[PDB]
Design a protein around this nucleic acid. Structure first.
Ligand SMILES: [K+]
Ligand SMILES: [K+]
Ligand SMILES: [Mg+2]
Ligand SMILES: [Mg+2]
Ligand SMILES: [Mg+2]
Lengths: 438, 247, 188
RNA sequence: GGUUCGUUCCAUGGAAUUAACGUAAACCCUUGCUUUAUUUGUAAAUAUUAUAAAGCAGUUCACCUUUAUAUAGGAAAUGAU
């Protein structure tokens, strides 16, 4: 028989049966749920809060490491560059800009997301690409030619050892030293700029950040094509420009706004509301009885028995050559992939994915500079300039009337706010920046 | 491949300099159809199928223009005039242009599920008040009422609350026709009493649905949504403010 | 070398577009209570569906996700660091949580389920599981006989640890664990 | 000049056409309803309290009145809800 302790947990069965009720009301489309990582910088939950109270402080320390990590540069002696010493501290605008880090926490690791605008690569790639093909074409001949006279008799062999290759190589270096050190310069500076995003140099930064969270950190570095798509990178650039005494405040703000391109719009259609009407294309309204025992039981279509035949009518299937056709397979080291992975066409999926994302286009831009920005070294009064282009509105709700999901209870989900504080030789100033998306 | 030597920019629509080009182009087309098919017979408005024409807002968004209400009001009188033409004699041209003015908006349907009656003939109604929730099981009986196992008098020590709990049965004069077995929770004495009023009323309508007009005038169908207002910082209570010192 | 017209797709792929299936419990004795928590609702509801699909393949009849009461903390702080006191504002931190309870689950099978969820845990979610198990009287002798069984399973796992001969940095073994555990948990 | 809770909307001006912010909308709690879930909550249960995710809902319909015919308003325990 069974135990009494076991029987005392069987009788406690007063469950409610799953009724499979049929919907008789019309359902609307659910709101756009913005990502979770964009509400708080640290997406985390832990049952012991000792791993939760120091995060605000660590965010400051981590962001400092990342900022200085992306500013690493070779020593002038490594690249043989002649350093031009000077008292003034040069401000470098052509480097890698980075925003504040967003960390996704689990009990096993942490994924650190950081948006970067790589401005140094834009210069290095174009500069090195000027070296015409004749360089590599002619350099090949020197290799072959040199082997005919130095490593061979006068007009792979077992009578050519490394001891001779060394001398054979030094001859080439001695004749092309001024040219190799040049190519080596741009080659190393470009590779350094490349390895900052790869595991060659990131595994070292991981060892430095891993000491704060006691978990291995995985980096997710997102390369921004334009510095206007992230507010953190924007206020940083504008702040570096204003740090110079001879900087024209109003002129610099106008040049940035001029770089911001806003999409064409019809003001009357954007500000037009939406009439609430039942959308019979929604999968919730198209099938008010979701049980397959009713859908596949010859309800509307003639013999759609196969559950796949039903799914192919609802979703977009990549496995099919014809969207509403049939899945025809072929019947009778290399990578392990299906024999049809090459024929799959992700042309309409990119539309499905990217059309289901909101706040893609840049909607509005707003800049504010406030503090001591005068040019003379005296006790003048604080300045305050404001420029904007477009609007920071949430069009989906303010005009169309749709329901949105505010961040942290009060913030609009489409705006990015960042502030950067600096100081002139006369006082402190700040640069605030808002960037909205449509 | 070379461009044409002679070229000049020309407006596409003749209403280029007007306030709303796209609207007038569509409005002038109606004026042309009406002037062309004015001799065709009509049908009295009583025999004209009712149509849901678009609104001034649907046109503004569709045409992307800021159409005027007065100018659109007269454009709507044409489609109603042309719509009155006899169907059989109505030309295909007017049938098409009229289909572009129809408003195909469907309101959402939300119908409440009817309260069933158990196999033993007891219907469950649910009522609520400030913080209380009641469940009344009304059954054909003699008039026995129980609240959390206790009698109506052993539970409510205030006759005002007893009359309010079973007011639905009293107003309709059916105290002696049903037995109620209520189970209340939360709230206070008056909160629970008024919660049972709505509970029994709903359960009663499950037995005799034709009593709702009477329970309306009795005040037992409406759900009173009044709720305690939270305390607000800077206030002594929900609205009481601290003493303000002028000096 | 001919083309075959597949009549349907693998059930593993079709089940991804149906609601998570559920096994039926013959007795209904709870074998595990997994409580999931998070400060957001979107990642909590997603991972709860993922946890139910894993319980189906393992033959574990899962029940839920049961929405447990929300845990709401409250703080009222002055909006100004200095004097201004008549102006304050309220803050909160609402913890959203769910409960997945498994019944009639084999003890070992329930541990593979939990091992799977931890390996594929979703960020921003905290988890806590209470496991139940029936055992006979004489626990002292049972745990002594299973020593040889556990040793065999660890023969290939001892490679994870390595220390110099006669590790001296540890000192008192028991006191090291007790103090090193506090340092890992941050104080307790 | 009317109208609106409102620079709201309509009409109009021998000068206007538009942008941003506030406003409004939306959001949070609350009210009715629909679906989902049933433990650690629920007397039982053919599922109705509670718990909490999503969705729907109003000044919507009826009645009355209604300017310049353009934009509307009123009635409030005895129309519906
Ligand atoms: K009070
Ligand atoms: K409920
Ligand atoms: Mg005007
Ligand atoms: Mg407002
Ligand atoms: Mg239980």
């Amino acid at each position: 028989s069974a135990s009494v302790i076991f029987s005392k947990y069987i009788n406690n069965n007063n469950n409610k049966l799953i009724p499979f009720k049929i919907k008789n009301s019309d359902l609307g489309r659910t709101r756009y749920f913005p990502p979770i990582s964009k509400e708080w910088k640290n997406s985390i939950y832990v049952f012991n809060h000792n791993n939760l109270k120091n995060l605000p402080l660590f965010d400051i320390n981590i962001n400092s490491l990342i900022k200085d990590y992306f500013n690493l540069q070779f020593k002038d002696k490594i690249l043989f560059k002649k350093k031009r010493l000077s008292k003034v501290k040069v401000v470098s605008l052509n480097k890698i800009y980075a925003s504040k880090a967003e960390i996704k926490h689990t009990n096993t690791k942490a994924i650190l997301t950081v948006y970067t605008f790589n401005r140094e690569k834009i210069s290095l790639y174009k500069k090195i690409k000027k070296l015409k093909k004749s360089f590599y074409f002619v350099f090949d001949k020197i290799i072959s030619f040199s082997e005919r006279v130095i490593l061979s008799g006068v007009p792979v062999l077992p009578w050519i050892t490394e001891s001779h290759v060394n001398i054979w190589r030094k001859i080439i270096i001695a004749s092309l030293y001024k040219e190799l050190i040049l190519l080596r310069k741009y080659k190393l500076r470009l590779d350094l700029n490349k390895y900052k995003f790869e595991e060659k140099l990131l595994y070292r930064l991981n060892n430095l950040i891993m000491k704060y969270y006691n978990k291995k950190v995985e980096f997710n570095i997102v390369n921004m094509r334009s510095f206007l798509l992230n507010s953190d990178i924007l206020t940083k650039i504008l702040a570096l420009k204003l740090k110079n005494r001879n900087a024209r405040v109003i002129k610099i703000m106008d040049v940035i706004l001029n770089k911001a391109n806003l999409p064409k719009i019809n003001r009357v259609q954007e500000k037009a509301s939406l009439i609430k009407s039942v959308d019979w294309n929604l999968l919730e309204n198209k099938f008010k009885n979701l049980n397959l025992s009713f859908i596949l039981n010859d309800a509307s279509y003639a013999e759609r028995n196969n559950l796949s035949e039903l799914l192919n009518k609802l979703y977009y299937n990549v496995l099919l050559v014809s969207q509403k056709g049939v899945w025809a397979l072929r019947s009778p080291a290399q990578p392990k992939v299906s024999s049809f992975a090459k024929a799959k066409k992700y042309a309409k999926i990119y539309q499905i994915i990217f059309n289901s994302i909101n706040y893609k286009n840049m909607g509005g831009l707003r800049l504010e500079i406030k503090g001591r920005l005068t040019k003379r070294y005296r006790a003048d009064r604080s300045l305050f300039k404001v420029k904007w282009k477009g609007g920071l509105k949430n069009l989906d709700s303010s005009y169309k009337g749709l329901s949105s999901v505010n961040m942290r209870g009060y913030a609009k989900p489409n705006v990015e706010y960042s502030i950067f504080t600096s100081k002139r030789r006369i006082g402190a100033f700040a640069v605030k920046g808002w960037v909205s998306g449509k | 491949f070379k461009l044409h030597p002679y070229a000049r920019a020309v407006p596409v629509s003749p209403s280029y300099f007007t306030r709303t080009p796209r609207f007038y182009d569509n409005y002038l087309s109606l004026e042309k159809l009406m002037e062309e098919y004015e001799d065709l017979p009509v049908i009295p408005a009583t025999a004209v199928e009712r149509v849901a024409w678009k609104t001034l807002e649907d046109i503004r968004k569709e045409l992307g223009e800021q159409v005027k209400a007065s100018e659109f009001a007269r454009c709507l009188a044409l489609v109603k005039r042309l719509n009155s033409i006899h169907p059989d004699l109505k030309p295909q041209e007017i049938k098409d242009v009229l289909d572009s003015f129809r408003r195909n908006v469907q309101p959402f349907t939300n119908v409440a599920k009817p309260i069933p009656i158990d196999q033993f003939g007891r219907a469950c109604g649910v009522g609520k008040r400030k913080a209380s929730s009641a469940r009344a099981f009304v059954v054909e009986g003699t008039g026995e009422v129980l609240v959390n196992g206790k009698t109506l008098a052993e539970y409510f020590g205030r006759v005002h609350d007893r009359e309010s709990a079973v007011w639905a049965l009293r107003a309709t004069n059916r105290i002696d026709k049903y037995n109620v077995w209520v189970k209340v929770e939360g709230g206070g004495t008056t909160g629970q009493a008024e919660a049972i009023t709505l509970a029994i009323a709903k359960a009663l309508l499950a037995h005799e649905p034709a009593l709702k007009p009477a329970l309306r005038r009795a005040g037992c169908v409406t759900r009173d949504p009044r709720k305690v207002e939270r305390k607000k910082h800077g206030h002594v209570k929900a609205r009481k403010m601290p003493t303000w010192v002028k000096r | 070398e001919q083309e075959v017209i597949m009549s349907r797709m693998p059930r593993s792929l079709e089940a991804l577009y149906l609601q998570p299936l559920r096994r039926e419990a013959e007795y209904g004795v709870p074998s595990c209570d997994l409580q999931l928590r998070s400060y957001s609702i979107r990642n909590l509801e997603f991972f709860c569906d993922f946890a139910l699909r894993a319980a189906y393949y393992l033959g574990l009849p899962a029940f839920g996700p049961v929405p447990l009461p929300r845990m709401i903390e409250r703080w009222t702080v002055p909006k100004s660091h200095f004097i201004f006191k008549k102006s304050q504002e309220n803050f909160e931190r609402v913890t959203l949580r769910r409960l997945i309870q498994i019944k009639d689950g084999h003890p070992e099978t329930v541990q593979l389920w939990l091992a799977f969820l931890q390996k594929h845990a979703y960020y921003g979610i905290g988890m806590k599981a209470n496991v139940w198990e029936f055992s006979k009287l004489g626990v002292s002798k049972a745990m002594d006989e299973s020593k040889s069984e556990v040793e065999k399973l660890l023969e290939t796992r001892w490679e994870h640890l390595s220390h110099v001969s006669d590790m001296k940095g540890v000192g008192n073994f028991e006191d090291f664990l007790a103090k090193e555990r506090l340092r890992i948990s941050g104080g307790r």
